Subunit: 215 residues, 4 copies
C-alpha cells in the first residue's frame, strides 16, 4: 500500500524560542515497519541557535514505529490522506514548548509542515546554557480520547556532569479520515543525535521505535 | 519624557491554534498613566476564527497600568528602549497557549511584534466550540526572578450558562536595558470586548489596569 | 449566629515528608472586621524540621470582611458551619494538601485540621527553613459544581530577597444549603507576629477583605 | 538478606475529601520475581465512598525483577529499609499524596502508610466509583540530590471505555547508603483479583520488572 517498506522524508520547521525566530529544513528516510529512521537537518534562518538543540529533536512521525499485529496502528491506516499532531512539552523548571507538524504524503515521501514555539526558559537553565547531552530513551503511553489518539510520555535530558532535566510530553494525534482506533498501548522510543557541527547548523538525527502492551 | 498622556498602538499578530494559522493586525490608543487603552483589531488571515477570540485578548502592554508613586515602574522605565515579554497560558482542560510580544516605540506610538500559539484544545472544549463569554477582572502578582520581572495571575473565562473556565498565566517581562527592579506588587486587571461582528473579524478591545501594594 | 467578637480552638494532625507532628491552638477574631489572631503550640514532632510558614494559611474565610453587595458563603453556613480542602503546589515539586472541618460551639469556632506534604527537596527553602513570610495575596473565588472554589497565587520571600511560588486550590463546602455567590476576590494578609526560637509557640495574625472587580 | 519468599504486613491511615479511613493488610511475594499479593481489610471509614483503585499503587519496589546490569536501590537498602513519598495528580484536579515507611522483621516487610487525597469532584470517576482498573505502565527512575525519583504516566480505564490520567511523582529514600543506579525503567501491572461489595475485603496482585529500554 501507500506505506512502503522504505520511504523518504521532507520537512521544514519554522519557530521561535523566547522570542527569537529560526527555521530548519531537513531530508531523511526510514522503514515504517522496522520503526527506524534518520535525517539531516540544516539551520536555514536565525543561526546559530542560542539554545539546546535537543529541545527540537522529538519534533523532527509515529508512522515510524514498529507495530505488532495485535495492535491497531492508527498512524499507517491514516494514509494516503495522512494525519497531524499537537504537542505540549512542559519543563520542570517552567520552560514550555508548543509544536505542530502536519503530515502529508507525496508519492513515496512524507512531507512535514512543522511549527515550534518555546517560552519562559531561564537564561541560567540547561536549555539556554546548552548543557544538554541527550534525551533518555522513553516509553510513550497512548490512549483514545474523544475519537482521536492521545500520546503522553515522561522525558528526561541527562545533563553535563550527570543529573537529569525532566519534561512531560502531551501529544495529540488526529487522522484526516476515519481509521480503526486502537486500545490502550505503549511505544518505546530511542532518539539520538549521531553527529553535528560546532554550532549545530548541520545535525544528523536517528530515532528507533517499537510498540507493545502490558507485562 | 518619553511616555506621554496619550499614545498610539500598532500591532501585528501572527500565530496558530490546533495547527490553524491566522493573522490579526490591530490599531488603538490609550492613557499610559491612567491605565486605559482601546483598540480595534481586524482578522487579516485565517478568518473566520474557529476558536474563542477571548484567548487572544490579553495578548493584545503593562505600560498601560496606573502605577502608584511608591512602586517602581518596570515598564514605563524601559522606553525609549522598550521591553519584551513571554507568556504561558495553561487551561484547566489541557489547552496550552504560548505567546510573545516585542514592544518598541515610534514617537508616541507603541509597536507590537506578537506571536501566538496554542495547542491541545479539546475539540468539544469551551474554546474550540466558542462558548466563552469573557474574562473576569483579575489581580496579577509581579515578582523579581533572575534580574527580570515575573507576573502570574489566576484567570477565568465566564462561560455562557455560568460557571467558569480557569487558566493560569505565567509571564516574564524583560526590559531592553537596565531599569530599577520593584519589590513585590500587584496589578488589578479588567479587559473586555466592547463590540465585534458575529465571528469577530472586527473587534473593539478595552483594558484598565491599576497596580497597588498589598492590602494593609 | 456570628457575633462581632469570636474565639477559636483547633488541632492539627499531619506529616511532612513522612515525619509526623501535631499542633493545637487558641485565639480570637472579628468576623466582620476580617481580622484574627491566635497562639499555636507544637504538641508532637517538635522541634519542627521545616519552615512553619507552610502551615500558617491552614490555621477560615469567615474572618474576611465582606461588603454588602457580595454573597458571603461563609458567614451564612453557620451554625452548621462548613469544611474545606486545599492543594498547595510549590514550584520545586513540594506538595501539601490540607483539610479543615469547622464547627461552632457557643462563640467558639472549632477546627479539625489535617496537614500532609511530600517531595520537599532536602535543600529547598522549606526543609532548610529559609522562608521569611508569605506576601499578601488576592484569592479568586468562583462557584463550581455547586460549591465554592478559591485559587490564589501565593509567594514566600526567602532569606536575602527572592521569592518561592506556590499555587493554592481550595474547595469550600457549606454543611447546609446557602446562597452561592458570584465571581469575587479576597485580599489576604497573613503574618507571624511572634514566635520563640524553634516555633514551638507562635502568635499568628490575618486580615482579609472581599471585593469585586477593579 | 532478602529471601525468595517474603511476607508483608501493613496499615494505611488516610483521608479523602476530608473523610478518614484505615485499612489493614497482610501478604507475600517473590522479590526476585517481582510478584506479590495481599489481602486488604477496611478497618475504618467503611463503606469507602470513593474508588478503591486510587489506593492500590500505595499498597514496595523491592518486589520488582531487576536484571543484573542495573543497580537495585531497593534490595541493597535492607535490612535498614527505606521510605518513599509520592504525589499523584489526576487530570480533573483531584490530588493524592502518600508516604510509606518500610521496615523488615525477619522475612516480613512492615509498612506504615499514610494517604491523603483532596479536591476529587463529587461527580467525578473517583467519587462516583466509575473506575475499572489501572493500566499497565512503565516507571522512569533517575537520581536527584542523592536519592531515587520515579515518575509514571498512569491511567485508570473507566466504565464505558476511555481513560482517566494520573501523574505519579515518587521519591525513594534509602535508610542507609546504597549505590545509585543510572536512568532506567520498571514496567508495572497491578490488579485487584477479588473483592466484596463495599471493597471491605480486597485481594491485590502486582507484577514488575526493571529494564534499560531498547
Amino acid at each position: 500500500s501507500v506505506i512502503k517498506p522504505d520511504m523518504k522524508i521532507k520537512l521544514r520547521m519554522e519557530g521561535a524560542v523566547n522570542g527569537h525566530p529560526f527555521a530548519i529544513e531537513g531530508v531523511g528516510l526510514g522503514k515504517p515497519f522496522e520503526g527506524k529512521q534518520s535525517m539531516d537537518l540544516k539551520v536555514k534562518e536565525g543561526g546559530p541557535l542560542p539554545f539546546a538543540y535537543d529541545i527540537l529533536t522529538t519534533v523532527f512521525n509515529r508512522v515510524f514505529a514498529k507495530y505488532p499485529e495485535n495492535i491497531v496502528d492508527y498512524f499507517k491506516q491514516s494514509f494516503p490522506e495522512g494525519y497531524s499532531w499537537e504537542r505540549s512539552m512542559n519543563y520542570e523548571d517552567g520552560g514550555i514548548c508548543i509544536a505542530t507538524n502536519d503530515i502529508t504524503l507525496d508519492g513515496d515521501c512524507f512531507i512535514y509542515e512543522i511549527r515550534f514555539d518555546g517560552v519562559n526558559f531561564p537564561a541560567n537553565g540547561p536549555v539556554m546554557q546548552k548543557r544538554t547531552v541527550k534525551w533518555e530513551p522513553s516509553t510513550e503511553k497512548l490512549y483514545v480520547r474523544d475519537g482521536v489518539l492521545k500520546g503522553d510520555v515522561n522525558m528526561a535530558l541527562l545533563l553535563e556532569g550527570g543529573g537529569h532535566y525532566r519534561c512531560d510530553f502531551k501529544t495529540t494525534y488526529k487522522a484526516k479520515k476515519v481509521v480503526q482506533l486502537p486500545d490502550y498501548h505503549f511505544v518505546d522510543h530511542r532518539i539520538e543525535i549521531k553527529s553535528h557541527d560546532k554550532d549545530y547548523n548541520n545535525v544528523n538525527l536517528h530515532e528507533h521505535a517499537e510498540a507493545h502492551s502490558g507485562l
